[PDB]
From Swiss-Prot, chain A:
Known disease link: Developmental delay with or without dysmorphic facies and autism: An autosomal dominant neurodevelopmental disorder apparent from infancy or early childhood. Some patients present with intellectual disability and renal, cardiac, genitourinary systems, as well as structural brain abnormalities. In some cases, the phenotype is less severe, has no systemic involvement and is characterized by autism spectrum disorder and/or intellectual disability, sometimes associated with epilepsy. Affected individuals manifest variable dysmorphic features. Deafness, autosomal dominant, 75: A form of non-syndromic deafness characterized by late-onset hearing loss that involves mid and high frequencies, and progresses to encompass all frequencies.
Family designation: Belongs to the PI3/PI4-kinase family. TRA1 subfamily.
Organism: Homo sapiens
Location in the cell: Nucleus
Protein name according to UniProt: Transformation/transcription domain-associated protein
Residues of the full protein shown: 3595 to 3682 of 3859
Length: 88, 75
């Protein structure tokens, strides 16, 4: 929902990176070859550069928690809860 | 319980998620991948049923009356 809000503000469709991934795979496969690990790396790098920057969640949090204490507390809680969730 | 618009929307989203799972399974063969019988049956069920104890009986009666909507018929 955070990602979709960022996309709606930017005006881009949220399923665009998946379409780009499959389009790039079709383009490489049309050349009669399987996609290497490097092709997948290039696709992910392209998605990161163009459509989904690394800072979407951070910029959302900075807007959502302008108070420094609230931002710190939220981030710390998020970190520990994610630690437990990933462990599980 | 949800109205028929929301039911059809939910089923479309579920089918899209299943299609994405199949697409990554068939990632080797994009532009040649075909739909599985499961997705075929899912879409057949969706088109056959397009969304549409006294409380449950009254809800069923309402749903029967809901099908008269011309906009729902055109959709």
């Amino acid at each position: 929902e955070i990602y979709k809000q960022r996309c709606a503000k930017k005006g881009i469709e949220h399923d665009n990176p998946i379409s780009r991934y499959y389009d790039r795979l079709a383009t490489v496969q049309a050349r009669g070859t399987q996609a290497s690990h490097q092709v997948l790396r290039d696709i992910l790098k392209e998605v990161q550069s163009n459509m989904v920057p690394r800072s979407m969640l951070k910029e959302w949090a900075l807007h959502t928690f302008p108070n420094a204490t609230d931002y710190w507390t939220f981030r710390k809680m998020f970190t520990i809860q994610l630690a437990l969730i990933g462990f599980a | 319980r949800e109205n028929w618009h929301e039911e059809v929307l939910r089923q479309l989203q579920q089918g899209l998620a299943k299609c994405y799972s199949v697409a990554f399974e068939k990632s080797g063969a994009v532009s040649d991948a075909k739909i599985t019988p499961h997705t075929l049956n899912f879409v057949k069920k969706l088109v056959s049923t397009f969304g549409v104890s006294a409380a449950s009986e009254s809800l069923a009666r309402r749903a029967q009356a809901t099908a008269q909507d011309p906009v729902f018929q055109k959709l």
